[PDB]
Each structure stands twice: as C-alpha cells, then as structure tokens.
Design a protein around this ligand. Structure first.
Ligand SMILES: CCCCC/C=C/C/C=C/CCCCCCCC(=O)O
Ligand SMILES: *[C@@H]1O[C@H](CO)[C@@H](O)[C@H](O)[C@H]1NC(C)=O
Ligand SMILES: *[C@@H]1O[C@H](CO)[C@@H](O)[C@H](O)[C@H]1NC(C)=O
Ligand SMILES: *[C@@H]1O[C@H](CO)[C@@H](O)[C@H](O)[C@H]1NC(C)=O
Ligand SMILES: *[C@@H]1O[C@H](CO)[C@@H](O)[C@H](O)[C@H]1NC(C)=O
Ligand SMILES: *[C@@H]1O[C@H](CO)[C@@H](O)[C@H](O)[C@H]1NC(C)=O
Ligand SMILES: *[C@@H]1O[C@H](CO)[C@@H](O)[C@H](O)[C@H]1NC(C)=O
Ligand SMILES: *[C@@H]1O[C@H](CO)[C@@H](O)[C@H](O)[C@H]1NC(C)=O
Ligand SMILES: *[C@@H]1O[C@H](CO)[C@@H](O)[C@H](O)[C@H]1NC(C)=O
Ligand SMILES: *[C@@H]1O[C@H](CO)[C@@H](O)[C@H](O)[C@H]1NC(C)=O
Ligand SMILES: *[C@@H]1O[C@H](CO)[C@@H](O)[C@H](O)[C@H]1NC(C)=O
Ligand SMILES: *[C@@H]1O[C@H](CO)[C@@H](O)[C@H](O)[C@H]1NC(C)=O
Lengths: 419, 422, 98, 49, 50
C-alpha cells in the first residue's frame, strides 16, 4: 500500500504561539516548454512518389491537400509568435555592466562568459549539453544521402518522402542576448524598467526593498547583511550542485523532441500497409495491370494515405494547443516574477517570494526562483489583546508576547523582540 | 505561377509561400533482361501427338526460353483464354519465375469448371485450382483428332470419391467404392462400383459432348530470379543519371549506383522498411546496384504583392550555392537556412518585415529592389550601475492604450441529408 | 458509386466538425481570460505586473465590439529623472535610523 | 474471436498501436491531474480533539 | 437537487460515448451484412475479402 507520507500533528493551544527565530534562502528550478518543431508536407511526393500515372488521379484531392498545408502553416506562425511573446518583452537591450562588487552577490555563473563561443552562461551551457536534438541542422545535400546509402539514417528517409523541417526565426545567440539584457536590467535597475525608464539603484537597496515587500523590516537585513549575502551565494551554489549532480533533470523538453521524432517516423513506416490492395507498391501494380484495372488499387492506396496525413495533422493541432497554454503561462510568470515581486502564493516558488532569473533552453525556459523559508522556531505565550487602562490596546504591526514576566511586541514571519 | 495556382487566385500578397519541391525529369530509358536465345517449346507443349487423361493429368517444366507467343498465330485457334493475376496486354514486358504447364482432355461443357471457386464432377474429384491462383487457362476444340467413327474410349474420368480433392493434387487409385452399409472386400456388386469411367467420343455428337484440350500455366511474376522472358530487346547500362529502367519486368525511375551489399544466390532484389525496391542484381553482369529517387525538394519563393511588382526571390533550404543537386542570374547569397537567389545583401540592420529564417529577414525598398539583412533586435542601450548614486523621477505621464480580445464565434448547424443526398 | 460518394461526404463533414471543436477551445480560453480581465481591472485595481496595462495600473474601461471587447487601460509612467546620492541610513546619536 | 479476421488485420496493427498510445497518455494525465490537485502537502496532519 | 451538475455531466458523457461506440456495430458500411459469421457462412474467401 503506497505511503501518502509521514504522519504528523500540530498541538493547538489557544494561549501559546511559535515565532521563527531563523530563516533560510532556498532556490529551486522549474522547466516549461515554449515551442515545438515546425513541419511541412508535400502531398504528391508522399502519396504518388514521382509517378505520372498517379498525380493525374490526385486532382480530385488537391483541395484536401491545400487544407492540410494551411493548418501546418498556422502552426508554424504560432510557434514563432510564442517565442516572441515569451522572450521579446523589452526592446531596450541593457548591456552587461563591468562586473562590479555587488556586496558578495555572485551572478558570474548566470551571466555570460566571454572566454567561450556564443557568450552564454555556464549554467545555460550545461542545460544546452544535457538535452539532445536529433536534427543537426538542415543542410543535408543530395550527395550526402546518395553517398551514405549503407547508413540508413532516418532523416534521408523522411526527406525522400516529402517530410521536411523548417528552421526557427530566432537563433540561439539572439535568445541568449535577450536573456542577457533581461539579467543586466534586473540586476542594475531593479523592478523599475518594467514600468517606465530604468532607474539605477544598489543591489542591497533593491533586495532591502524586497524584504520590505515580504513584510519583514529592513533591520533584519541591516544587522545581518553579510550573513544574508553569503546565504544567497550558498543557495546559488546549491543550485549549481543540484544541476550538475543529477543528469535526469530536463524531461519535458526531451519528451517534446522525442514525440515529434516518433510522429514523423511512424508516418514514414505507415507506407508499408496495403489498404485492401494487392500490393503496397505502385510500381508493381503498374507493372502487372492495365490502367482500367490499376485505377481501383491506386484509388485504395490514395484514400489510405490521405487518411494517414489527416490523422497526423489532427494530432499536431492538439499538441499545439497544449504548447500554447504552456507558453502563455511562461509569459505570465516571466512578467510577474522577473519584472516584479508577486504576492501570489506558490507561484514564483514555494514560500514568501523574493525574485527570479530566466535561463534559455531548447524549446523552453528554466526559471531559478529565490524564495524565503523560516528556520527553527520557539514557543511563547501571548494575549488576545493587551489592555492597559481599560481600553483595549492593540499593536500596530507586531504581536504581543511574553517570557512570563515582561511583554514584547513582534511580527510574524521572523522573530523580533521589541517594545 | 506555382503559388498562384496553389492559391487559386490571380493576386498574391506578401509572404514566403512554400512551393512544392525540386524535381528532375528523366532523359533516357534502359532495358535489362537476361540473354536467352532459344525459342520456347510451344510445339511440344501445346501440340503433342497424344494427351493425358484428366484424372492422371501431366505436369511439365519450362525454363531457359523466350516467350514469343506470336508464332502460334498461324498454327492455332483458341476458344478460351483467361488470365487471373496479370493483364493480358502486359505479357510482352515481363519475366516469369517458376513456370509449369498442365494438360488434359475434357468434354465441351466442362471447360467452365477449370476456374477457381467452382463445383462439379471435375472440380471435386479430378482437378482443383487454388483460390489465389496466378496464371492463365487455355482451351481449344479437338474433334478432328480425338474422335473415331466407331467411338474413342481411351480417355477416362473419376466418378465416385469419399472426399473432395485439395488444390493441385492427383489420385490414381482403383479401389472399389462402397455406397451401402454392406462391406465390399473387392468383388464389385450391387452397392460396389468401379470408381473410374470412360468418355465416349463420336465425330457426330453434340458440341457439348465433343473433346476439348486444356492447358493451364502457373507462375510467379516479380520476386525471385527468372529464366523465362518476353521478346524485348535489351540496351546498355547507364549510371549516375536519372533514367527510366526495366529490370526483369520491374518499371520505375531513379539513379543507379554501385553497391556494397552481397546477395545470397537465391535472391534477386531487396526492399526497405517502406517495402520499396532499393537494390537489384543485373541479369547479365552479376553485380549489385542501388536505386535512389531523383527529386529531393526544399523550395520557397519570396515576393511582395503582385500589385506592387513582379520580382521574386527563391530560397533553397539545402544547397551550398551551386547548380541545384539532382537559375543563377547575378545575385547569390548563402544563409544557414539555405541559398537565396534574387536578393542583394546589405550590412545595415532594420526591423524585420518578411521572415526568412535563421535570423534573416527581407524587405522591399528603393529603382526598387529586394534586400536581405540580419534582423534588428532593437536599439542598443545600457544602464550605468552606481550604488552610491540613486535616481528618482520628477515628472510622470498618464497614458491610455487599447487591448483587443475575441469573445465568441459564429454558431452553425448542418443537415446531413440535404448536404449528402440533396 | 453512391456509397463511395456517401463515404467521402461524411469524411468532409467530420473534418469540419473537428476543426470547429479545436477553434472553439481556443475561443473559450480567450473568453475566460477576458472575463478575468473584466473582473480584475474594471471592478478593481490590479497589482499584477503587465496585466491591466503597461505600467502602474489605475483603471480600465470596457467597450463593446462585434465578437469581442476593447479595453482602454489608464496607466502611470514616470517621466524625466535626476541623479542623487544615497547611503543605507544615518547615524545621528549612535543608533542607526532607517 | 474469428481467425479469418485478424489474419487480415496485420495491415492495420500499426493504427491500433497509435490509438492505444493515445489512450495510455490520457490515463496517465488523469492520474497526474488528481495528484496535482490533492497532494500539495506531504505532512499528514491529524485533526485535534 | 440541481447543485452538482458538472460532475454528473462528466459521468454521463463518458457512459454515453461508450454506449454509442457499442451501438455503432450494427451498421454495414456498404457490405451485404454487419455480421462476420453470416458472410463467412455464405461466401468463399476470395469473395469474403471485400
Ligand atoms: C509454353 C507455354 C508458355 C510458357 C512460358 C510462359 C510464361 C508465362 C505466360 C505468359 C502468357 C503467354 C504464353 C501463353 C500464350 C497465351 C495465349 C495467347 O497467345 O493467346
Ligand atoms: C484559551 O482556552 C482556555 C480553555 O481551553 C480558556 O480558559 C481561555 O480563556 C482561552 N483564552 C483565549 C485567549 O482564547
Ligand atoms: C540561520 O540559518 C543559517 C543556515 O545555515 C545559519 O548559517 C545561521 O547561523 C542561522 N542563524 C541562527 C541565529 O541560528
Ligand atoms: C564568486 O565571485 C568571484 C569573483 O569575486 C568568482 O571568482 C567566483 O568564481 C564566483 N563564484 C561562483 C560564481 O560560484
Ligand atoms: C524574557 O526576555 C527578557 C529580556 O528583556 C529577559 O530579561 C527575561 O528573563 C526573559 N524571560 C525568561 C523566562 O528568560
Ligand atoms: C549475357 O551476356 C553478357 C555479355 O554481353 C555476359 O557477360 C553475361 O554473362 C551473359 N549472361 C546471361 C544471363 O546470359
Ligand atoms: C500460314 O498457314 C497456312 C496453312 O498452313 C499456309 O498455307 C501459309 O503459307 C502460312 N503462312 C506463312 C506466312 O507461313
Ligand atoms: C503440330 O506439329 C506438326 C509438326 O510436327 C504440324 O504439322 C501441326 O500442324 C502442328 N499442329 C498445330 C495445330 O500446331
Ligand atoms: C488425405 O488423406 C486422409 C487420410 O487417408 C484422407 O482422410 C483425406 O481425405 C485425404 N485428402 C483428400 C483431399 O482426399
Ligand atoms: C557551405 O559550405 C561551407 C564550407 O564547406 C560550410 O561550412 C557550410 O556549412 C555550408 N553551408 C552553409 C549553410 O553555408
Ligand atoms: C558601493 O560600492 C563601491 C565599490 O564598488 C564602494 O566604494 C561604496 O562604498 C559602496 N557604497 C554603497 C552606497 O553601497
Ligand atoms: C513636470 O511637473 C511640473 C509640476 O507639476 C509640471 O508643471 C510640468 O508640466 C511637468 N512636465 C510635463 C512635461 O508636463
């Protein structure tokens, strides 16, 4: 019997309270698809295969062919606009500043590294390496497939039958530039450049504004600036370690790639079936039978192959709907987690949210979310409302607690003994 | 014009407009058959001095011959000719694998029973054909040879059997057949019958009671090697060009190239996962050749509107800007998306107008011409980071924008009967 | 012959209905987004970033249209600025003031 | 359960495999839906007196 | 009574789809009958293939 989890309990006491003495800064990872592969189909090459007797009988189905091609064109344009909406929010490229002291904060690993091609971050480099792509570009020449007959590579097989893959408009370097501009803007000007021109501000000031956002006073930072900066450095180290240690991290992107490849390959394999005809080869039928008797078999084959193409197109449309929903969610999370700080619960990370960073990926994006989680706690005694002189007095911002002889007021997300 | 025909309109807007593919046409035709010189034994097979009885029918093997059936035109006249797995007009262009010939004599009104799916005396107890039969059936009258004034009784047929025969099986037993429950133990009597019976042919009997001679041919057409071929002259072998070929009756078009795979002695050609022929063994020089399609594809056309101009640019997805692998005027440019012909490359970067691919866009501008360029992401900028320096705005602006969202779509209903039958 | 025609025409009708279903799903997603936009920008002031306008949000007005709706978002944008000098706090009598 | 049929269905077993893959995907999706709605917390808290 | 409608609609939709799938077996798609046993009883293989 599967275990739901470790059974636990909370002791309800109406004259007691627990307030967190300490806290942690934790960073997690999140993976979302953005776009799929774009494809187009030639009817005549897939159905008739360079036969003149065929394709003189396909003049009665060219209309269905036009409909299929229209649907595929719509899908391709949709993929392009999905990438635009996710990554092209800002048209002002913000150059990465000369790496300055940020108070211990270390964006060296998320910022581009000049001493390598394409000027991309080491974490992005690892993410690019982890996911495999079965395309290797689109430059396959006729001589390349003609010479390599012995190696039955699948790409030549699906390209000899009218199935081709079109390249996306935005190259990888362009997307890296977009992400670099986003990171530079968000590390210099804070949240300002989302609404109006960017205004310069120290990083300690911006993240002290973040603490004031979550409801924790600035003094918690100010008395412990170096400790908290070291804490964030430790969190980003934990993220690099977690990404490097476990190969099985990026699954959804790989699943998208594998699904597209499998769909094309099964379309290729379905040419071996005869749909009640004497054979699955047009050449054999045309070699053995006269035209009035060959027309029947050719018609059966044409009907079957059109049915296969229609099934492929329908599946592609449904998958496009799913990816559209994911892309819209990615755009919303980008806007609400890197252009501002969200009060929503469990949206930009588990816990009280601080900020987020994007990293590029093939067919998707990876979000590094920086959250707040309280550490160990200590129980205390309280009163429903501290009445001093007959008029119920209430604290403005904290909660009144006592050790047993003295009364102090303190807030909720962190322990702050104050009078 | 191709995109005009695809859109079924005489006006075309701007775009990229995927065309069909790249195609190449054959220029030559070749024929390769094995060298046979001897004519095929028609005179022995059709034209024997004696023929067998239907129950003890005869089988003969035919190999290493040329099937020119035009030599029978002045010799024979046929009353029945029907083929099953092949069209009679394609017999001059084929080669046949495992030919056999069967021959016997029957009545006139029993020739209809030599066909698949039949029932009757001959089909049940004498001669049976398979349901999936491939071959031809021939018959002709023989009253002037197999009839005598007194009566000819040499031909025999079977009358009684306990069970029906399986296809292409023969029995020549002479055991006594029992009809009643009384055991026979030999000695034909009241309920015991001799199974075989004799035809009686006279020169003055009816048309359905006259003898007929039947020959049945069976074979397999394409798979496996063949040694019997039609009367077609052979040609020379052409390699590394798109030609029309005919290898042992198999027709197609493609490019032939030497191969490394080795066949077993009982194999002639091979197939791939799609069940298409990709290799073949030459009948004359025993060598292995591969077959590759001629058309490969990847073409698209870039144009402004037809109202504006009639200039176009064409994109080939997979070419290192040379002659197109199986029309360069002045401008050739190379991109990661492919070779672009008909545009002028420019160093300046503008806003994207018509998306080409791999970070290249096109536009129409000033004498007007089509240009291609790397798309501009936007205006380069930077922000100074200075922590001891903070900046706060002293004016603001109040602005209004517009947002457009669809809500509903049209409601429609369909009547099946009026749309389909009407 | 009549059976061939019947089968073809049924196939055409089924294809039409499938495309209609997919389009209806997309339109329903748009309609839900529009309903939330109304409820959260016209009946209230939203704190979400880039949801009810390009900048700090003030309000929004609805306008009708055939098969749709048009939203007019009134937004705050900061104009020209000036640089100054800042420090984390001020130590006046030894105790940091923030 | 006719043997003459399903000897002629070897030409369409591929389409059958495709259909079955789609249905299996739907089933796994339903299980994940229920888990994503109801399994937010892993510490099972017991109701007090 | 008319409070929990959407859940019941889901259940009804699934059941009705399965029942319609069962009922569609009564149609003959241009054949002489919708029963395989009937066709196999009256006709030989080369004619029953169609
Ligand atoms: C010796 C018998 C034939 C052996 C070789 C034949 C192989 C395959 C048969 C092809 C058909 C042509 C041969 C029979 C003549 C047809 C009758 C006619 O001409 O009307
Ligand atoms: C707490 O509960 C106890 C009994 O359980 C009761 O006597 C007391 O008045 C309560 N106090 C408050 C502040 O709820
Ligand atoms: C709070 O937790 C961090 C995390 O390890 C630790 O380094 C720090 O000492 C803790 N502070 C206190 C006061 O316990
Ligand atoms: C932290 O920053 C220093 C530069 O001061 C750099 O050398 C080091 O590699 C960084 N550590 C990271 C990015 O983990
Ligand atoms: C509670 O805090 C005060 C500090 O003002 C301390 O003097 C007192 O002893 C504490 N109570 C206990 C029980 O330790
Ligand atoms: C056919 O003739 C060629 C010479 O023209 C010879 O090399 C070959 O072995 C011959 N083979 C057959 C099939 O007769
Ligand atoms: C054809 O056959 C007839 C009768 O046997 C004969 O007279 C005639 O010469 C033949 N023709 C040829 C061209 O051999
Ligand atoms: C059979 O062959 C003989 C020669 O042996 C010839 O005289 C006769 O006409 C032939 N018969 C037919 C009908 O071919
Ligand atoms: C084959 O032999 C068996 C055993 O004698 C017999 O019962 C059967 O009928 C035979 N087959 C035919 C077609 O007669
Ligand atoms: C063209 O040829 C060069 C040199 O072989 C090669 O680097 C390049 O990838 C080829 N294709 C394109 C798209 O330029
Ligand atoms: C800011 O950083 C510089 C070093 O880059 C340092 O000299 C200065 O004192 C710091 N001041 C503030 C306001 O953080
Ligand atoms: C800036 O603010 C002043 C004071 O309200 C105003 O008079 C001036 O018009 C503002 N600037 C613009 C461009 O309106």
């Amino acid at each position: 019997t599967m275990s739901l989890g470790a059974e636990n309990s909370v002791a309800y006491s109406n004259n007691s309270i627990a307030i967190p003495t300490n806290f942690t800064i934790s960073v997690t990872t999140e993976i979302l698809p953005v776009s799929m592969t774009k494809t187009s189909v030639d009817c005549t090459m897939y159905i008739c295969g360079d036969s003149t007797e065929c394709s003189n009988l396909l003049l009665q189905y060219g209309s269905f062919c036009t409909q299929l091609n229209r649907a595929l064109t719509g899908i391709a344009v949709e993929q392009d606009k999905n990438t635009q909406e996710v990554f092209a929010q800002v048209k002002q490229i913000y150059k990465t500043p000369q790496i300055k002291d940020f108070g211990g904060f270390n964006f060296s690993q998320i910022l581009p590294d000049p001493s390598k091609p394409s000027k991309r971050s080491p974490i992005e480099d690892l993410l690019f390496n982890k996911v495999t792509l079965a395309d290797a570009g689109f430059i396959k020449q006729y001589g390349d497939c003609l010479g390599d007959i012995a190696a039955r590579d699948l790409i030549c097989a699906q390209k000899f039958n009218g199935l081709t893959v079109l390249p996306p408009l935005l190259t990888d370097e362009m997307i890296a530039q977009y992400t670099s501009a986003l990171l530079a803007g968000t590390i210099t000007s804070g949240w300002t450049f989302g609404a109006g021109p960017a205004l310069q501000i120290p990083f300690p000031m911006q993240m002290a504004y973040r603490f004031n956002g979550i409801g924790v006073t600035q003094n918690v930072l100010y008395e412990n600036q170096k400790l908290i900066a070291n804490q964030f450095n430790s969190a980003i180290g934990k993220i690099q370690d977690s990404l490097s240690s476990t190969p099985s991290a990026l699954g959804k992107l790989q699943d998208v790639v594998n699904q597209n490849a499998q769909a094309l390959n099964t379309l290729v394999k379905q040419l071996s079936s005869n749909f009640g005809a004497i054979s699955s080869v047009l050449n054999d039928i045309l070699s053995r039978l006269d035209p009035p008797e060959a027309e029947v078999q050719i018609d059966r084959l044409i009907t079957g192959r059109l049915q296969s193409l229609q099934t492929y197109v329908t599946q592609q449309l449904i998958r496009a709907a799913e990816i559209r929903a994911s892309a819209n969610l990615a755009a919303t999370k980008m806007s609400e987690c890197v252009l501002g700080q969200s009060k929503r619960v469990d949206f930009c990370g588990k816990g009280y949210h601080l900020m987020s960073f994007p990293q590029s990926a093939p067919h998707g994006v990876v979000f590094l979310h920086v959250t707040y989680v309280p550490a160990q706690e200590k129980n205390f005694t309280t009163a429903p409302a501290i009445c001093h002189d007959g008029k119920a007095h209430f604290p403005r911002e904290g909660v009144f607690v006592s050790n047993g002889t003295h009364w102090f007021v303190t807030q909720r997300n962190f322990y702050e003994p104050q009078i | 014009s191709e995109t005009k025909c695809t859109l079924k309109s005489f006006t075309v807007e701007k775009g990229i407009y995927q065309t069909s593919n790249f195609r190449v046409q054959p220029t030559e035709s070749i024929v390769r058959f094995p060298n046979i010189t001897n004519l095929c034994p028609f005179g022995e097979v059709f034209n024997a001095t004696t023929f067998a009885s239907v129950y003890a029918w005869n089988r003969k093997r035919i190999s290493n011959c040329v099937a020119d059936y035009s030599v029978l035109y002045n010799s024979t006249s046929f009353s029945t000719f029907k083929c099953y797995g092949v069209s009679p007009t394609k017999l001059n262009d084929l080669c046949f694998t495992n030919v056999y010939a069967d021959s016997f004599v029957v009545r006139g009104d029993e020739v209809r029973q030599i066909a698949p799916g039949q029932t009757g005396k001959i089909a049940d107890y004498n001669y049976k054909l398979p349901d999936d039969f491939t071959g031809c059936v021939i018959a002709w009258n023989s009253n002037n040879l197999d009839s005598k004034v007194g009566g000819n009784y040499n031909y025999l047929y079977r009358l009684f059997r306990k069970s029906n025969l399986k296809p292409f099986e023969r029995d020549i037993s002479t055991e006594i057949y029992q009809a009643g429950s009384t055991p026979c133990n030999g000695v034909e009597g009241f309920n015991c019958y001799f199974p075989l019976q004799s035809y009686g042919f006279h020169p003055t009997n009816g048309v359905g009671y006259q003898p007929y001679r039947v020959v049945v041919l069976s074979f397999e057409l394409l798979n496996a090697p063949a040694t019997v071929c039609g009367p077609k002259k052979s040609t020379n072998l052409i390699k590394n060009k798109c030609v029309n070929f005919n290898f042992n009756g198999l027709t197609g078009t493609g490019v032939l190239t030497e191969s490394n795979k080795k066949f077993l002695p009982f194999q002639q050609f091979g197939r791939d996962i799609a069940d298409t022929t990709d290799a073949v063994r030459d009948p004359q020089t025993l060598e292995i050749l591969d077959i590759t399609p001629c058309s490969f594809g990847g073409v698209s056309v870039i144009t402004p509107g037809t109202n504006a101009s009639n200039q176009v640019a064409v994109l080939y997805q997979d070419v290192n800007c040379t002659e197109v692998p199986v029309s360069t005027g002045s401008n050739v440019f190379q991109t990661r998306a492919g070779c672009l012909i008909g545009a002028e490359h420019v160093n300046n970067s503008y806003e994207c107008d018509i998306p080409i691919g791999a970070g290249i866009c096109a536009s129409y501008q000033t004498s007007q011409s089509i240009i291609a360029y790397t798309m501009s992401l936007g205006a380069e900028n930077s922000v100074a980071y200075s922590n001891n320096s903070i900046a706060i705005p002293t004016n603001f602006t109040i602005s209004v924008t517009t947002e457009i969202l669809p809500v509903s779509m049209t409601k429609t209903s369909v009547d099946c009967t009026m749309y389909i039958c009407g």
